[PDB]
Design a protein around this ligand. Structure first.
Ligand code: SF4
Ligand code: SF4
Ligand code: SF4
Ligand code: SF4
Lengths: 183, 184
């Protein structure tokens, strides 16, 4: 039983506004053109091994089911862009899902491993930072012990911290600058 | 993931055959006219409190999903005939569900209480047979101690046993005549 009181009439608009200006109004507003044909669900490789149905995400969005933001289903999309490529209504499906995830993240629906990966780029400027074995491995091959990346360049590392703070990404992931850990 | 190997192409025909000649070919074949509009599900009173969706039963039947016969969902239908009354495609929905249940029963998907009720009509000719308190109650009101029913008339009781045997209802419910009890 789904009553009006359970639905959010602005959910669709909220997704569009979250998608403006990145990736853009015209891109995200494409969800409004979906005619629930199911080409996205049949194309989905994740749907072949889970309860995830790409078409229902768009449906829930258009109907106003906020629970979609709390669903684990949206995080099962690998972003292979196969649905995006085949949709006959030009729905920027993959892009819409990412934007939906942006709203989910703002609601506090983020995995720890994900927040950890985000923290390593904030702290060491990289998703997979170099370890003690990296230095030995790079040397043994015939490459610079330390690669010319932002990890070993404070200037670049600080530039990211400035941008992050301004963007509010630190607040989003719930990062405490003094402790250097998440909340 | 639903593959062809999991489906039974003849399921729909099997339901129609089970419904012939009772309630009839034309009655049960009406499932073939369902266009999945959902008027039956919206009308269903059971569907408001359960996962039961009247429209999906018809869908599974047309698609070939045998699991529908093993589902508890079909047994949640109260036979209120509300879907039957509103379907715009003249689908004899209530009648189809009963026939579907007939096939479920043949597969051995019957509740014990149901099998027990069926046994009481086989043994005592009635769903709710008279007990020691009935005789006292009927007397105290001003009615015949024993009602004029098949329960206290062997002739009528034996007639039912003859029909049952011929119908194979005893075999269906898995009733052993010598022990007077059910099997499994
Ligand atoms: S494909 Fe585009 S149109 Fe068909 S459903 Fe998936 S989203 Fe709506
Ligand atoms: S993109 Fe996300 S949704 Fe579209 S197909 Fe690859 S996984 Fe399924
Ligand atoms: S109503 Fe008659 S037609 Fe519409 S769904 Fe239920 S059955 Fe199929
Ligand atoms: S008949 Fe069985 S199904 Fe059709 S409505 Fe009444 S209960 Fe729901």
């Amino acid at each position: 039983m789904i009553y009006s009181s359970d639905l959010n009439k602005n959910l669709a608009s909220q997704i569009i506004e979250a998608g403006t200006p990145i990736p853009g109004d015209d891109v995200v507003s494409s969800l409004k053109a979906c005619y629930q044909c199911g080409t996205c669900t049949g194309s989905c490789p994740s749907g072949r091994r889970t309860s995830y149905r790409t078409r229902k995400v768009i449906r829930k969005a258009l109907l106003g089911m906020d629970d979609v933001l709390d669903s684990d289903d949206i995080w099962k999309c690998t972003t292979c862009y196969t649905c995006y490529e085949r949709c006959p209504r030009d729905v920027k499906v993959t892009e819409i899902i990412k934007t939906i995830r942006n709203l989910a993240a703002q609601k506090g629906n983020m995995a720890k491993a994900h927040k950890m990966t985000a923290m390593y780029v904030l702290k060491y400027g990289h998703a997979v930072p170099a370890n003690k074995n990296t230095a030995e491995l790079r040397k043994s091959i015939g490459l610079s012990e330390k690669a010319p990346i932002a990890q070993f360049s404070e200037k670049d590392l600080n530039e990211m911290n400035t941008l992050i703070k301004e963007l509010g990404f630190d607040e989003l992931i719930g990062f405490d600058w003094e402790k250097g850990a998440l909340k």
